[PDB]
Design a binder for this molecule. Structure first.
Ligand code: ADP
Ligand code: ADP
Ligand code: ADP
Ligand code: ADP
Ligand code: ADP
Ligand code: ADP
Ligand code: CKP
Ligand code: CKP
Ligand code: MG
Ligand code: MG
Ligand code: MG
Ligand code: MG
Lengths: 308, 308, 308, 308, 308, 308
């Protein structure tokens, strides 16, 4: 199966030590961005994927290109923008809240925010089994929002990660635009959590949010944080619980789960063991700096499962 | 409110790996010293502070001056000793006792130890709301001890952290000299713990130690290690529990608590709320190498209290 | 004497290894920005300085403040911008050209670019012996350009580093705006080089460039890169050669020279000797990553001269 | 007392971050190999020891010699092979299984594997109080297996750590070769665990495995993983529980326990106390990268026990 | 144009500090091996290429695949070995000879040595414009040598880097196997040096070595180490001098020259200019640890030449 | 042949980046001190050596013991002082003077300074072929001075490195004390340089300084700094020139030369060859941090000489 994602790839600067950034002197570079992470989680389970994204005509842009190409992602439908730089962010870890991370963005007016419907080619989108994007892509600019509408219009099957970021838009704006997108397009997959349900449906309860969402989405993945996740489908509920592991950086974990779940679905996994495997990938993710560098293959997940 | 502390600022050489120093090859420099730590913690809560301290005419001494001045500490009452070197120490972490650190001093004949009553200006000391020192300052030299006596004679309100270091003086010396200071000068605040209570009073129980200490102090902070702290004030007793977090280096945690509690008292906090917030400060402290680098602002503490 | 400078403080991310950034994974943080660099170089010779700059209400903003305050720079006339982020930049070293570096900016719509006439206190500016800015400040925004005009309108004596950055503006607008400034305001000091001389006057010959510039500036420092610099004053020229040293990062060397040179002038140094000493400062600067970290005191320069 | 071990010394390259090696860029070097771990653990409790091993005529060879010599290990009966390299291995940490590690060997045809009967001096082996080897040594080559047979024939008292590596030989071969060894040579000490018992006897219950092994060994140490260990001696059994500590790398922990236990036995420690202390050594071991760097002295073990 | 190389891809472990490996504790991982380096230098000048190689079924094997795929090399003719490990090497730098490096191999019976004629597809080989191998491939095994003979029997145009490694065979066998190859297969390009000329022909002088080699090759590149390189073609000689730059690691530089030179020939560069450009690539190569990480594009080479 | 040195072993904290220590955050540990350095240099040329030194009962003390024992140094005549710390120092590199280093001591009242005649075993000293010390040991304390007097009284053949440290004693005391020692004890070897000659003799010219020193020493090694060294013996003079290498840290270089020269004299080397070889040892020394880690063997020197 082939996944096509639409969004902004970012270069990540991950603090080498925890604490406020004013006292961190070293930063470790990684390639990330939600849809880039989804792509890699998707191929790791043995499917194919491409990303529609625009990067700058700079080192960070070519870094993102080389990294994803090396991972086996189809990068041939990416664009290079000569008049705008690649977006970046910094990660401050475990401060002021232990176990949590904070993203600090330098993405405004980036090459990535300049993604437009003109970059969404019907001939390519038609080749996909699933077209995926996020609330991040909706939020970064109106051209990128337009690009999601275009791709979703073309798409037979649609996947959406809520991925709300209050640093990119108000909670009210986030509610309005997502409800707007869900109104226009019925989804095969909705990936969200209780934090975003609270913003969108004024509803923190996983069972209630999932019921309010069942009209827009066939299969709903409700992430609970460290506790794990619940999948809702065919009038069933299934809770897959998290694991206790050393937390280095949780950034990337929701995408690791999201991407792994979607890929196993297309490998014919039953819903519950797709989630069980997806939780393994997100568990491993929090253990490291880097959103992508220990996304597990199916065999690695199964090794974990034997011993854990 | 203005805090004035007297003590020895030290440069810290924190092992980059846990284990016996004989097999650690890399060390990370920080600026520390109990009274320097108290100042920054005090400042972080929106109050003002100065330190009366002597450093060497050397790179480490200017390091200490620049760092503190950068934190907004008043450094205009510091001295530079013409010939004695700035005091330093090394931290061996998690060995041979996990979750604990050991300080290895190179402070004998240091510029810090040459602090004397002649460095204590009377009108400066009158300008403070609270004057603070510790058992460390008493232990390093006769002149430093004298300096603390002079400051405490001039002070209207006095604070003292027992901070007993058996590497600097014997248990009897400590009991003697601390008891002598407390008999001479009633305290507004005593900051101590169980280990120092047993050495000074023979008494290990929090309540029994606190009752004895109330002959000398109005408000008693009885620290308990990872379990947290108890404040005793008036006829009340209040326990504030610690949090479970990954432990990097506990060095500094007691000052993080002490200094934060003190600052919040002068911001008008109830004793229990001031202790609660102070526990947050010392919790974040144990998570990092460096005694000062992740001292939180009041806002940071509240963020922690919400998302925790 | 007191220097006041106007410009944008930047946080620097300096590659830990040479080469194209797409293959560099580790980045080291420094506090930089031309006017910030001038400030520190000026105080290192024992004069006073302040900076009029705007930073963000973010970790990188308070980093800039703490660092500059620690260095003894007057920071009380800085502003904190509630909405825009602190400007940042990356350094790629020795690639594709050995011994050279290149700055990669993320400063568009930064807090620093939102410096305006409103941030320039008239009484504060009157307090300076020398008011200093550069071509970077002119180029970053209209309000920051406006701010320099205001400052220069009030100033008794003016200093200007041409500091042309062709990533910030075109050669023609650099030529036009610099000459517009020079014709409106006579300078006590002009700091430039043969590169910027080519752009502003078409003149690559340092003597002819100086002759052209002498209508606008009393004292002209014409830097020549590795080979040293020339001071033109009193109808005379003095050339001071550079030194051959291992080159880590040349970034900041120009500010090291200009700032040190200015400060020694006010210290009563004879003109040509003041340039000799400033060359030592720029020499030392190229030997490390960080624009400020090894700025020498007058005594350090003399140790260098004794031994070199 | 004197321990002589026979085995392959290995240079270890320890992944500086967790995750699959294809995305780890940094490796930290350590001297290891099971019998070298035993030697150092043994010397740390105040007895003497030597190793019979062969290393390459190469930097890694000389590294092992100098390190072991520095630790106080008799290295005079080691051999330098001119035609084969020192064997090495890489450690992949916490991936795919959290808290566990994986060794990736580059040891085939190594100098270590060329250990042979002729390298075993009768006189030297007779000077030992205890002659010790492992399943690793039987598995690496015939010559090394035959070397163990020769030394065990000459030895009065024998010690054996099963140390089964499925990467070195099959379960069936390991079962065959170990049972064959035990049938030929009565052991004073068998050091093993529940995994190796399952392979060798088809029995994973500690007590039943111990009873079955009692035909061949006089004192049986049954390691349980994180849970601790049980010692079987004189129809008696004694469980000594492990400690919960942050796990950096478990590699070496079983040798740290085994060597410390053996040495304290020869120091005249009561059996239960000898195991309590050996558990401290292995507890400390899992806390760092490096099999040998934080092996505790008896004194260090006692400090640990006072506090914990 | 399309290049096809045949040879062993190796994982490189690069000493982070100079000196004998026995006192170097940290190693930095890179992807290298001569033909792999040629491939990437070839792609950097805008041509296509692929590599015929086999890697182990291990992290280091998938690391090599991802890296090269990421760089744009065709990896579809690479194979995974069922049982043998990916070959690796360590680099000791600047000891005992300043500015020089030493490779220490763990490659015997590697996956890469098991490259064989049955892995070389005739139609793919025939599709290439140039087919290239080295003396390393000839040396590692007879299956690999067989594979080179096969590819060279099929190829219309051939290229060969002598790349003699005395750790892999004797001077005598190198002389014999290379002369045997040259007299069977006429080459379009011979890439070599004065060291290998001495071994193969007993002739160290470049002109006279080139004269003797002209019997087997149309275009001879005679590298000179730091001094640069001479190309001999069509009765002409052209010397292109090296540059003085700080040397971090010269490992990789000759491949960098070779691959860049070959690629620019197919871009229609005049021979002399191709060599000058090739020298820029090798010049930058020596400045970093990593054989591939700062291989320049043609554009980057032009930037170098413009300001140097 | 056996060298016995008497001195203070120090633990070295080497700055990981150049510049003023106030801005260096990372330090790298090495075992050092002049007589320790001589010992290892002596051993490296295949002779035997021991050291009489007192270290603390601390991690750094045991670090020193293990290191020197690992290098093959006889360590059995060292002492542990239970009441005083092992001495340490920091190295600040390339600031304020390029290519030079400075040592910042924390050695006052160290265990090494408590070296006393009591610690000099008469029997052991009589077993030496050469008993060596330096001006550092005369300067650290009066007991250590007396230790050198005792050992020199017992010895038949003596060696002395002037090694003047103006941070340890005044120019006049250094002159006075060294002339005292030279008058009391005829030296077989005097190792010095033109800086120390200027202080002791008022003479910085090599020939004139040697002429004056010839009344006191049989063989004089006059080090010149980077440009090399001269030997004076048997009415002969021989200058061996230095080499141009990249300089990391010159600390240790004079001891590398000293120790290597002495040891090669005892291998029966001509005086000129011994010096030549010694220069290579000191050339390599300046290229790394660490006084000891790249001391070459005779074979390493021969390789250097072959290529260089
Ligand atoms: N602190 C943690 N410890 C262990 N696992 C975690 C932790 N945080 C996240 N995870 C894993 O990652 C998954 C997704 O994390 P979550 O925060 O729910 O994602 P998102 O932020 O994208 O909604 C969780 O279901 C859990 O399996
Ligand atoms: N191991 C730990 N884990 C979590 N928090 C800790 C730990 N150790 C100390 N703290 C925090 O720091 C505070 C002070 O620690 P404590 O050891 O009492 O300081 P002191 O040594 O100066 O008495 C504690 O009350 C607690 O909030
Ligand atoms: N490669 C170098 N080697 C040695 N010194 C240098 C080098 N580059 C710059 N410098 C020193 O820095 C000073 C200013 O450098 P320059 O490049 O002219 O700055 P700017 O680019 O701001 O004009 C020079 O005059 C010289 O003393
Ligand atoms: N995850 C862990 N946490 C704490 N201690 C551990 C852990 N793993 C091992 N240990 C300690 O090391 C000892 C030996 O570990 P074990 O796995 O039994 O060794 P082996 O595999 O060689 O039999 C244990 O008994 C325990 O004390
Ligand atoms: N020390 C050095 N300094 C500068 N350039 C170098 C150095 N070593 C190699 N190079 C560059 O690399 C090219 C090839 O180096 P060389 O040693 O001839 O490679 P090989 O040994 O593989 O033939 C040289 O012609 C030169 O341009
Ligand atoms: N900057 C340098 N460059 C190259 N070699 C050096 C340098 N400094 C010292 N050396 C080498 O080390 C030797 C010892 O240096 P020297 O300064 O004479 O030591 P000391 O200060 O102990 O007398 C020199 O003779 C020279 O061979
Ligand atoms: O904006 C700039 O270019 C800048 O502010 O100049 C500074 C460098 O100045 P220099 O290139 O004149 O040495 C550096 O901090 C940089 O980012
Ligand atoms: O006490 C000393 O200065 C010392 O013992 O000299 C040693 C270096 O001296 P050198 O530079 O003459 O070799 C060094 O280790 C140092 O600390
Ligand atoms: Mg998410
Ligand atoms: Mg305390
Ligand atoms: Mg400039
Ligand atoms: Mg084991």
């Amino acid at each position: 199966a082939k996944l096509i994602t639409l969004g902004e790839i970012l270069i990540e600067f991950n603090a080498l030590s925890p604490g406020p950034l004013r006292h961190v002197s070293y930063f470790e570079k990684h390639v990330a961005g939600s849809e880039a992470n989804y792509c890699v989680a998707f191929i790791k389970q043995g499917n194919e994927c491409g990303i529609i994204a625009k990067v700058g005509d700079d080192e960070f842009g070519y870094n993102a290109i080389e990294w994803l190409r090396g991972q086996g992602v189809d990068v041939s439908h990416m664009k290079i923008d000569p008049s705008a730089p690649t977006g970046i962010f910094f990660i401050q870890r475990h401060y002021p809240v232990p176990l949590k991370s904070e993203s600090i963005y330098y993405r405004k007016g980036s090459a990535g925010s300049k993604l437009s419907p003109e970059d969404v080619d019907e001939e390519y989108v038609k080749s996909a089994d699933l077209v995926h994007s996020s609330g991040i892509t909706l939020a970064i600019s109106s051209t990128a929002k337009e690009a999601v509408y275009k791709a979703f219009e073309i798409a037979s099957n649609r996947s959406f990660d809520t991925n709300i970021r209050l640093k990119l838009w108000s909670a009210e704006e986030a509610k309005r635009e997502i409800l707007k997108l869900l109104s226009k397009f019925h989804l095969k997959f909705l990936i969200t959590d209780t934090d975003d349900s609270k913003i969108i449906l004024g509803e923190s309860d996983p069972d209630k949010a999932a019921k309010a969402f069942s009209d827009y989405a066939e299969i709903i993945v409700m992430k609970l944080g460290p506790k794990g996740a619940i999948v809702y489908y065919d009038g069933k509920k299934y809770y897959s619980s998290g694991y206790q592991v050393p937390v280095e950086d949780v950034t990337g974990a929701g995408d690791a789960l999201g991407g792994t779940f979607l890929s196993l679905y297309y490998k014919g996994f039953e819903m519950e063991k797709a989630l069980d495997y997806a939780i393994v990938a997100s568990t491993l993710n929090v253990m490291i700096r880097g959103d992508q560098e220990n996304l597990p293959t199916t065999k690695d997940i199964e090794t974990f499962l034997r011993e854990m």
